[PDB]
Write an enzyme that holds these catalytic residues in place. Sequence first.
Site, mmCIF file in Angstrom:
data_model
loop_
_atom_site.group_PDB
_atom_site.id
_atom_site.type_symbol
_atom_site.label_atom_id
_atom_site.label_comp_id
_atom_site.label_asym_id
_atom_site.label_seq_id
_atom_site.Cartn_x
_atom_site.Cartn_y
_atom_site.Cartn_z
ATOM 1 N N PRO B 5 0.804 -1.228 0.000
ATOM 2 C CA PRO B 5 0.000 0.000 0.000
ATOM 3 C C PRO B 5 0.836 1.277 0.000
ATOM 4 C CG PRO B 5 0.025 -0.964 2.195
ATOM 5 C CD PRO B 5 0.898 -1.836 1.341
ATOM 6 N N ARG B 6 1.598 1.479 -1.075
ATOM 7 C CA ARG B 6 2.540 2.596 -1.210
ATOM 8 C C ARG B 6 3.307 2.472 -2.522
ATOM 9 N NH1 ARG B 6 7.359 -0.687 -0.955
ATOM 10 N NH2 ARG B 6 6.909 -2.341 0.571
#
EC number: 6.4.1.1
Lengths: 96, 96
Positions: B5-6
Amino acid sequence: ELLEEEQQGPVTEQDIISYVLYPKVYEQYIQTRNQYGNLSLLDTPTFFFGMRNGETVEIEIDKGKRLIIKLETISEPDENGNRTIYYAMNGQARRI
Amino acid sequence: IEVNPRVQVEHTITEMVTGIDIVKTQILVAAGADLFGEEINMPQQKDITTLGYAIQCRITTEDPLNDFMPDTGTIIAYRSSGGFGVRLDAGDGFQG
């Protein structure tokens, strides 16, 4: 008009009486500020002595803004008596 | 397998073939920008393609001759390449 003509615009009320109070002295400060910029930000020892080989000097410029100057070496006087100073300023190699 | 998630290290690859600034898009998305608005300009899905192929690899202080042991020392010489279609993201590798 006199100052605004010698400089090119930004002349405040402080300049005017400063000049009137000190004709030549003020002019000289302008000559230096043109040449070297704001010196009042240098630390005193650096102001009077400069730097030595391998030294690193922090110059506080603004909250969070500062110049980090390392002085690597000073070269020999060339055929015109100029010496090359090897600098590192803010992670960038420079020559003066 | 998993979700990350990045951004990842390897994101540059995708950027080159799709032509989208992932990182810039991240800032614009956080600011409230619609994908198909005027800042991000995301092509609509079936208009996103790949233009040729893109490769990344990494330069590490790991020495392949000792089970990848990350050597700790000083850089005294650094020559990066440069080129059209070449992308350098410099981390711990510079002159000094």
